[PDB]
Amino acid sequence: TTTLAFKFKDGIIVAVDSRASMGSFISSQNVEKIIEINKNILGTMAGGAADCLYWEKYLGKIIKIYELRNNEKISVRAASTILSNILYQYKGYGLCCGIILSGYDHTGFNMFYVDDSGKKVEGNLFSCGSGSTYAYSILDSAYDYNLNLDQAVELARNAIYHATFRDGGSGGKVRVFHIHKNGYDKIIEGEDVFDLHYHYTNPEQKDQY
Amino acid sequence: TLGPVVTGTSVIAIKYKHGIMIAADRKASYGSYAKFQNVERIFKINNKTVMGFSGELADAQYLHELLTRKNINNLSEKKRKEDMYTPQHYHSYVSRVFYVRKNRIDPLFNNIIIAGINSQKYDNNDDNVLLYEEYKEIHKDDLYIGFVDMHGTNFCDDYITTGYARYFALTLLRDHYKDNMTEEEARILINECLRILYFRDATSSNFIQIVKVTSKGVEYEEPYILP
Amino acid sequence: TTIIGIIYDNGVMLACDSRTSSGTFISNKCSRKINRINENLYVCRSGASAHSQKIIEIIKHYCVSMKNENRKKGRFHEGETKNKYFYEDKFNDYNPLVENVAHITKKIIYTNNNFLSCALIFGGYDKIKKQQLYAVNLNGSIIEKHDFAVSGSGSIYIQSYLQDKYKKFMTKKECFNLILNCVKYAMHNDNSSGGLIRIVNITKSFVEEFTVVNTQMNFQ
Amino acid sequence: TTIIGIIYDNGVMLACDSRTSSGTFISNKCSRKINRINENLYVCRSGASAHSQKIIEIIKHYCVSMKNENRKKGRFHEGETKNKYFYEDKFNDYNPLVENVAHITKKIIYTNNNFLSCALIFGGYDKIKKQQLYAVNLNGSIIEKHDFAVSGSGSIYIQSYLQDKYKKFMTKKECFNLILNCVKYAMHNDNSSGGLIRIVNITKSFVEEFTVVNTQMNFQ
Amino acid sequence: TTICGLVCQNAVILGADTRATEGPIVADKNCSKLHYISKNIWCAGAGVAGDLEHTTLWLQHNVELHRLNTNTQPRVSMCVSRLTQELFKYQGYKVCAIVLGGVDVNGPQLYGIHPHGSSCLLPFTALGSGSLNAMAVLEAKYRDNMTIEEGKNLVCEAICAGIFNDLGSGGNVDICVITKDSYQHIRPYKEPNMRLYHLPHPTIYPKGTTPILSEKIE
Amino acid sequence: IYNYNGGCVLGMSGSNCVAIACDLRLGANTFTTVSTKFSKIFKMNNNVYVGLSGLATDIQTLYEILRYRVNLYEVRQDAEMDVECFANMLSSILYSNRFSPYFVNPIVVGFKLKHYVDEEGEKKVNYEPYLTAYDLIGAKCETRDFVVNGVTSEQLFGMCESLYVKDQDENGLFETISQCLLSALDRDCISGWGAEVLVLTPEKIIKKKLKARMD
Amino acid sequence: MDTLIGLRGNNFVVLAADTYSINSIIKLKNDDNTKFYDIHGNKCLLLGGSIGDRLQFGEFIRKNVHLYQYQNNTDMFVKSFAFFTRKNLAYYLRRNPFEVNCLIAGYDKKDGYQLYWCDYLSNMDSVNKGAHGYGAYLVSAILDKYYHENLTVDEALDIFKLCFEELKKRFLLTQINYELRIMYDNKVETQYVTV
Amino acid sequence: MDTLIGLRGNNFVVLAADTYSINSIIKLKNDDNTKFYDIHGNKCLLLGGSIGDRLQFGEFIRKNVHLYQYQNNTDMFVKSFAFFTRKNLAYYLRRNPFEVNCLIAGYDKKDGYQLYWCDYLSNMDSVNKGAHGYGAYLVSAILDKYYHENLTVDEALDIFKLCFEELKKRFLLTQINYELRIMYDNKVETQYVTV
Amino acid sequence: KRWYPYIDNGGTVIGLTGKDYVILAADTRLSLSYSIYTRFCPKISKLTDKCIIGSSGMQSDIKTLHSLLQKKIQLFVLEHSHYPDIHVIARLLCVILYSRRFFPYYAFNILAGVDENNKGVLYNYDSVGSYCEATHSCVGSGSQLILPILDNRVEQKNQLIKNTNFNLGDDINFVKDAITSATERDIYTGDKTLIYVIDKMGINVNTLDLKQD
Numbered sequence A: 001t002t003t004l005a006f007k008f009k010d011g012i013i014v015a016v017d018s019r020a021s022m023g024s025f026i027s028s029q030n031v032e033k034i035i036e037i038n039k040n041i042l043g044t045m046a047g048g049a050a051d052c053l054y055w056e057k058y059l060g061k062i063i064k065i066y067e068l069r070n071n072e073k074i075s076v077r078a079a080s081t082i083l084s085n086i087l088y089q090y091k092g093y094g095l096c097c098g099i100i101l102s103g104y105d106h107t108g109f110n111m112f113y114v115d116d117s118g119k120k121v122e123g124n125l126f127s128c129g130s131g132s133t134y135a136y137s138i139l140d141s142a143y144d145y146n147l148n149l150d151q152a153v154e155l156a157r158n159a160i161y162h163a164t165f166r167d168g169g170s171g172g173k174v175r176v177f178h179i180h181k182n183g184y185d186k187i188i189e190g191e192d193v194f195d196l197h198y199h200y201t202n203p204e205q206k207d208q209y
Numbered sequence B: 001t002l003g004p005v006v007t008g009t010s011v012i013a014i015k016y017k018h019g020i021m022i023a024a025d026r027k028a029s030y031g032s033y034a035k036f037q038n039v040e041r042i043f044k045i046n047n048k049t050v051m052g053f054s055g056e057l058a059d060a061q062y063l064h065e066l067l068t069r070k071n072i073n074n075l076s077e078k079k080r081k082e083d084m085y086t087p088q089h090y091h092s093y094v095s096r097v098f099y100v101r102k103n104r105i106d107p108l109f110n111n112i113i114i115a116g117i118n119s120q121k122y123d124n125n126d127d128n129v130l131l132y133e134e135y136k137e138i139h140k141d142d143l144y145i146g147f148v149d150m151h152g153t154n155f156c157d158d159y160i161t162t163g164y165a166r167y168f169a170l171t172l173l174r175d176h177y178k179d180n181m182t183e184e185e186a187r188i189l190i191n192e193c194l195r196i197l198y199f200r201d202a203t204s205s206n207f208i209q210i211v212k213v214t215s216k217g218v219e220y221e222e223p224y225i226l227p
Numbered sequence C, D: 001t002t003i004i005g006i007i008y009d010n011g012v013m014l015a016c017d018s019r020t021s022s023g024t025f026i027s028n029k030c031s032r033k034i035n036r037i038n039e040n041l042y043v044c045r046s047g048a049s050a051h052s053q054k055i056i057e058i059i060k061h062y063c064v065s066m067k068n069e070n071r072k073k074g075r076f077h078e079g080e081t082k083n084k085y086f087y088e089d090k091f092n093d094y095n096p097l098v099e100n101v102a103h104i105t106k107k108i109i110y111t112n113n114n115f116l117s118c119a120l121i122f123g124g125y126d127k128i129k130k131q132q133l134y135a136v137n138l139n140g141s142i143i144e145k146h147d148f149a150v151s152g153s154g155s156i157y158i159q160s161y162l163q164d165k166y167k168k169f170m171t172k173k174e175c176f177n178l179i180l181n182c183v184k185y186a187m188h189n190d191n192s193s194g195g196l197i198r199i200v201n202i203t204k205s206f207v208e209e210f211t212v213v214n215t216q217m218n219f220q
Numbered sequence E: 001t002t003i004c005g006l007v008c009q010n011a012v013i014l015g016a017d018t019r020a021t022e023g024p025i026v027a028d029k030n031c032s033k034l035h036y037i038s039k040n041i042w043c044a045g046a047g048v049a050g051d052l053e054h055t056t057l058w059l060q061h062n063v064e065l066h067r068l069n070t071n072t073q074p075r076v077s078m079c080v081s082r083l084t085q086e087l088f089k090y091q092g093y094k095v096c097a098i099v100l101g102g103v104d105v106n107g108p109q110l111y112g113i114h115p116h117g118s119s120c121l122l123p124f125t126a127l128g129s130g131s132l133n134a135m136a137v138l139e140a141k142y143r144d145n146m147t148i149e150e151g152k153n154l155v156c157e158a159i160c161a162g163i164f165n166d167l168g169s170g171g172n173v174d175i176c177v178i179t180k181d182s183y184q185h186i187r188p189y190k191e192p193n194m195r196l197y198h199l200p201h202p203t204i205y206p207k208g209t210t211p212i213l214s215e216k217i218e
Numbered sequence F: 001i002y003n004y005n006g007g008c009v010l011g012m013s014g015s016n017c018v019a020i021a022c023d024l025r026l027g028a029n030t031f032t033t034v035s036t037k038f039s040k041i042f043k044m045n046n047n048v049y050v051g052l053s054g055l056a057t058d059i060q061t062l063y064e065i066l067r068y069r070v071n072l073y074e075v076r077q078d079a080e081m082d083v084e085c086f087a088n089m090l091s092s093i094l095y096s097n098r099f100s101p102y103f104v105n106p107i108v109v110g111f112k113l114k115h116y117v118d119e120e121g122e123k124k125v126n127y128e129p130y131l132t133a134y135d136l137i138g139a140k141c142e143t144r145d146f147v148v149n150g151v152t153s154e155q156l157f158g159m160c161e162s163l164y165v166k167d168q169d170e171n172g173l174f175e176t177i178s179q180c181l182l183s184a185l186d187r188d189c190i191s192g193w194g195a196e197v198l199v200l201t202p203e204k205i206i207k208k209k210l211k212a213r214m215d
Numbered sequence G, H: 001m002d003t004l005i006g007l008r009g010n011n012f013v014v015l016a017a018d019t020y021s022i023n024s025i026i027k028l029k030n031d032d033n034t035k036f037y038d039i040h041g042n043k044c045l046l047l048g049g050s051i052g053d054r055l056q057f058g059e060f061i062r063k064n065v066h067l068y069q070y071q072n073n074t075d076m077f078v079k080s081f082a083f084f085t086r087k088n089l090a091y092y093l094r095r096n097p098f099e100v101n102c103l104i105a106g107y108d109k110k111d112g113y114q115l116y117w118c119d120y121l122s123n124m125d126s127v128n129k130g131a132h133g134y135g136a137y138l139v140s141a142i143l144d145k146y147y148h149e150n151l152t153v154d155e156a157l158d159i160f161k162l163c164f165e166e167l168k169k170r171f172l173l174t175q176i177n178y179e180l181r182i183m184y185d186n187k188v189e190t191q192y193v194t195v
Numbered sequence I: 001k002r003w004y005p006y007i008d009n010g011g012t013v014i015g016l017t018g019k020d021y022v023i024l025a026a027d028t029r030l031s032l033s034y035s036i037y038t039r040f041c042p043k044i045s046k047l048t049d050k051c052i053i054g055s056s057g058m059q060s061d062i063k064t065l066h067s068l069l070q071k072k073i074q075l076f077v078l079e080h081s082h083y084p085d086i087h088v089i090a091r092l093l094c095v096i097l098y099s100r101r102f103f104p105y106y107a108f109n110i111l112a113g114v115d116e117n118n119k120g121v122l123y124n125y126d127s128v129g130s131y132c133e134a135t136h137s138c139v140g141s142g143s144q145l146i147l148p149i150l151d152n153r154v155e156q157k158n159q160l161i162k163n164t165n166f167n168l169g170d171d172i173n174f175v176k177d178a179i180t181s182a183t184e185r186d187i188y189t190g191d192k193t194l195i196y197v198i199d200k201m202g203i204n205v206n207t208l209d210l211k212q213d
């Protein structure tokens, strides 16, 4: 389980893997972590399976009603705050979820990490999940905010690879989305046998390390 | 309901051609002490059903009251003989009782068996519950032998033995039971099961009660096994 | 706490000892165990004393709340062992008012189907079934004993002695001696040995409450 | 595991049942309990079967290691109940070789003053004290019973029945019936009821090992 | 794991299933639970396999060593005494519910042993998980002083109960008749087997991908 | 056997060639990889290959004690050491530590070298597979065909149970062990950062490192 | 708790560590510790964990190695040293745990620059890019991306500078001071890097 | 875990905090957090502990205070605010712990510059030099020595600069970035100090 | 002593799909820890004319989740007069399971059916409202043995992609292979199996007999 975000020069690159494991066994490997909340705000599953799939669907219900009654598109900051509050009500009940409610509203490109304990926080370069430590590693040394869409998704895909390659609980197809001034387009609904692309380009050994 | 102290033991309920033949010993043991040796563990909850019992005794007499008063609730709103509660109904109702309690953590430790004739092809449209010829063949598909574990696990077979016979008399039944047995064939088969239990099962004894649910009613008798 | 019930030919006896052990220290000798619910049916309580206290309080409340309730309106039935402290009292007979024992016993299961460890024994006279003698258990498992019933810590030391000496239809005299010797033995070799023992004789028309003060000596 | 020892006028009986319950499941009916240490003294073991196995193995090792040791050199004493399976054998009398029971019992305390929960009973004939009958306990607390001794799970249901029916000086016939009825009762109302019961009669000059196969029926 | 044995008119018949389970799955479906000890006594253990297998191997040789020092056929009353003494030192750790039998100067003797060390003498017994099932059918039809071809049939019928009515027991039943002079290990004895084989399912030669292939001829 | 230091080992038999295969991940923590070169199969003898799996601390410690014992025994015999006796060594070394056990689950594969019986000739040796398995206690179970042991045991029993077929040549046995291994290491997250298949024949040893999934 | 980073090319071995001494409740006791244990035989050794175990496992190994190189006029090879250090650490894993994390290093006349890797449980194996402590979750990925094969020694420092700013910017307890060892051309030199 | 320092003279109140967001396993999630909660009524509030409790105790107080200042055209005094914040925190101490550490501050027309101090257990009391978190073990003593009475606001910053270099040099997890609030002359201004 | 209220009755539910059909195969053994309650307890229930659900948890929860689910579907039929699509039943089960999140049903489910012309779709859950549409899946005691097999005969990570074509006639033989391979190697996998095939015209309940050991 991994995730990214950038708020780079002209949008946001949310990127995740697609693995879902139960201890050691791999329950499934074609799971869609990215969740479309609004036409602009799009969440990200992580941590527990249901305890994050359900709420971002539940948060989907809350925004549809509000965005309908007031007929103004909700903002990320408002969307994040609603999520963290209902997530707070279940402190001791064992909910486990880390959600990066990236999106776009009238006030520019926002971004908000949310955790199961109402850990709402504004930022630029969040990443949650078991491999997030490696994901921060690659980004911080490469992230520039003046990247263009071409090499930004290359950087996002690059990080998700290095996380999945090094981490055990992360792997499988990598997704890399992007957020315009409106909407979002799935730039990569991709593959993951590409270690033999980045490093160890020519298959002749095992790439010992 | 915190722990079993006065516990019954195994019952066996097979079906032969004239109806069910459910048998049970008549001992309730207060732990490792045969405190009661004339307790009855097979109650009549309808003119066509019985209700087996294993585990702690405090809860049969509970679950007996629940059914025995549901039965009269039926017996009051009955216009035709087809309005009676089939043994399937109870076993699907008892299953609910055990399951709804498993939602809480009070299971009422038991292994209730619901057995009876699941049909109305034989006229008994005058219920003398308070105070009470030849057998009829029964299609072996109109007889329902339920079972409910204290976790809600329920199913029906041709023969259901619960409690501790599930390791002793089940092996005999699984390889010597044939459909459409006869009166004396079932009794000797059961007597070859309980005699196995009485020898190897510490919490069981002689003095069997055998109940048969035939096309005419529910009949009782009290053998005493000969080793 | 030893505790007994025997059914002789025309009435039921209900003995007990009198001791409330609380961790090897006798809180009090000479404590009531054979309570009085109604004129004809007596409760022999055991187990934890605190729990058995409330139950008898509740039952005395119920057995009065329906003793008067099942009264018919008009006039009815106008057609007609040293140092043994003894006294008897009579009923208000024909038993239309006094309710059956079977209710009181079965009323217990509903009442004490809880986490309330008491092990009562009920003995009384009745109109329909003459002399019945029930045995509630820890979790409320009443079984109508027809011959005798024991309970409490010290009963199990006389289980066999009772089943051997108990005849079928006994007279009041020889039922008294058997129930006297039973409690004494359950006292001689048990550390819940009461002091005086309180034999009670519920019968058709009266209830006499003996008390006996004695010990055992053996020639062996 | 019920287990008995009675001392009649001129010899000691040692009954037992035959059942090895392991959690409500009879591991085996017809198991030995009245062991044979030497010709005259028999052990009635109880408690955990594994622990009682080693102890009897050790004792059989000791009782032989000194049976021969206390032999004098030269020639000495040149001056002179259905289906009951019975057989008797004789001693090698004058008892100079066969060592006293009191050692074997007291040898146990030293041996099983450990974390080894076994509750034996020893019965034998001897030269000096005629027929003794000890009762080792869980922690090795031997007390020489002079009248009778019981142990195991099912004994306490016949404690009173034994103390009542036990006379002082009994004959072999009426001691047999009492020890037969005792084990049967401890079996009728206990969930460690053996199958056949193995009455053993150690006496002055022989040892006869009965086995009885019977149940109880009561008129009540 | 179900193991049952019984005696006959002059011989003792052992018997066992064949499988070892990690607990949610099986490890193999052919694991001889009978175990040779000497020419005239065999043992058929249960419980954990590591403690089981080495206990017999240690005993299988410690009898031969004793048979060589003396010149008498080993006595079944001996091997039981060495088992219990070793087992009890490990009161609940060398867990192995061994049943063994054989012939000696006395008749055919069958001892049932338990992990703590309690050893009994029985005319028939069954151990392991299926012992409950095996003992039932074993006890109902057992009759004192039968003959081999119905003794073998019964013990095969006995384990066949523990094969079906139990989850921890399955595979091919087998038997070891231990008559006074010889033994008759009949390692396969019945056929509870598979149902469907659609095709061999072979793969074409170029599969995998093998970034490296270092081949060495010795 | 731990999720700490995940790993798996498999071995199957053919006509007269056997193949042993194992992953190459040394998992420092359960969900972390720190090496993709930790081969878990060792040449205990020129035709006795052992495949260890489990706690990587006790893989090497047990490997060294085996190499210490085997080299000792080979020298004192002037001759090579066959599997059948070696397999019973490993069932005693493990069992000697029954109370403080090495957390390894070894697999022993390699040719049995049946009799030097020499019918109608001076040399007649027919090699036989002789696979086997073990457990941390040391209980073995000889098996004429596949043996699997490791954390992925329950993901590989199923794969072996179907795809395995009785007798095959090396060019096909390698395919049905490589495809039988690769597709079970794609379903266990604590093992499978590179596989290695080593099929051996009475004449040559063929060692391959497959193109596994680095996930 | 303490970050150890080890890199190795084909003609150099570079080790790195943080020079803090966390080793008290919260007080950063010493801002320039000693974790490395330079052996004469052109090897090195780098430890982690509680200093009570570093000081007596590091010093114990320096002796038995130095004793070996003196009892036998030779100098121990890295591989023998790497599998000897592990063996002792595995020796005590069931008597006295010695909760330490190693990164053996060194040069050989035969096998060249070998790096190794031992966890607190003895899990020795050669690698090309090690890491230890809670900081290993953040420098490992950096090491993969920028470690192209056949590096020059000056590049590896630029990778290390890239790893150090990573821990400062994102690690929990922001290490600022680090100490390296640069093993190449048979010249074991040292340098300290801040930030 | 997070350091809060509060100082107060007779004509100023200065609060300080570290701007880290430890708030994940080990990853320094955000290097510039928001712990302060500026109230309009010329007060302030500074919290610590898990951000899940800061964000909903800080925001809950801002409302009930702002609601009060709007429902009643007045503006709440510091003392009422200080003993109201404590009361709610004590209200939930036996229902929902709200593990937070406060440093109430503010200005009054009557009582002047008041600083306060509440622990995770509600232990309110006025002080002149507060501190919280594991860093309070190191800045408290610094505050005593250099806090002479009737300070000028510029001196207090020099004390704070003296406190910040102390945490960097000797604290466990070396905080480098800090954010202050300088309340004086009815001018609540803010500034960020690095190192 | 504390009365742990969860048991695993075993059984497995193999699922497999294609452009025209979905294949759902479940055993019928219902076993307690080591003894066996019955040789035939159907773990597969049908909800609509073209949607079946298979579960492999504890039999009390299996039944009370299927009975409850049908109650909410026949309710849907009455109010809306048209049977719910599988997608509707998919989310409806997600909520029901998650509605009891903090005391979850011990019931792993696989939901199978057809929505478009065929477009054979198959969801699987884990006892708490988390469903991912998949090509092939199984849940139960034998789950860890079958998912490896199906991943090598549905998704081809082989060098040359053979068997890229799958026909209903042959896929049944794959499933019968999987359900039988697990039967030997797994303890709880049953003795009689029921294979349900949902094609464009209806459901077929053809049966197969497995090992009884």
Ligand SMILES: *[B]([O])([O])[C]([C][C]([C])[C])[N]C(=O)[C]([C]C1=[C][C]=[C][C]=[C]1)[N]C(=O)C1=[C]N=[C][C]=N1
Binding pocket: A001, A002, A019, A020, A021, A022, A023, A027, A031, A033, A045, A046, A047, A048, A049, A050, A129, A130, A169, A170, I126, I130
């Ligand atoms: B990911 O690996 O964390 C993944 C997230 C995906 C479901 C959106 N979740 C899990 O792996 C969790 C356990 C876990 C492992 C490592 C870190 C955090 C959590 N398990 C599940 O999500 C799951 C999936 N299917 C069934 C059961 N559980």
Ligand SMILES: *[B]([O])([O])[C]([C][C]([C])[C])[N]C(=O)[C]([C]C1=[C][C]=[C][C]=[C]1)[N]C(=O)C1=[C]N=[C][C]=N1
Binding pocket: C001, C002, C019, C020, C021, C022, C023, C027, C031, C033, C045, C046, C047, C048, C049, C050, C052, C152, C153, C192
């Ligand atoms: B009898 O011994 O059980 C006696 C009968 C009671 C009705 C007066 N009661 C008690 O002994 C109990 C102790 C006990 C014995 C056996 C099981 C459980 C409890 N007496 C008390 O508990 C007690 C009474 N007063 C003060 C303190 N404790």
Ligand SMILES: *[B]([O])([O])[C]([C][C]([C])[C])[N]C(=O)[C]([C]C1=[C][C]=[C][C]=[C]1)[N]C(=O)C1=[C]N=[C][C]=N1
Binding pocket: D001, D002, D019, D020, D021, D022, D023, D027, D031, D033, D045, D046, D047, D048, D049, D050, D052, D152, D153, D192, E114, E118
């Ligand atoms: B008797 O019931 O105590 C009996 C006498 C023994 C000498 C054969 N033994 C046992 O019952 C014991 C159980 C036990 C009862 C009471 C206290 C302690 C233990 N039998 C066993 O322990 C046993 C024997 N074989 C196998 C398994 N368990």
Ligand SMILES: *[B]([O])([O])[C]([C][C]([C])[C])[N]C(=O)[C]([C]C1=[C][C]=[C][C]=[C]1)[N]C(=O)C1=[C]N=[C][C]=N1
Binding pocket: E001, E002, E019, E020, E021, E022, E027, E031, E033, E045, E046, E047, E048, E049, E050, E052, E128, E129, E168, F134, F135, F139
């Ligand atoms: B049988 O199931 O008991 C079997 C008999 C064994 C001697 C071949 N053993 C086991 O199943 C044990 C677990 C066990 C079950 C029942 C009682 C005690 C122990 N497991 C193993 O024997 C084993 C064998 N190889 C590898 C792993 N485990």
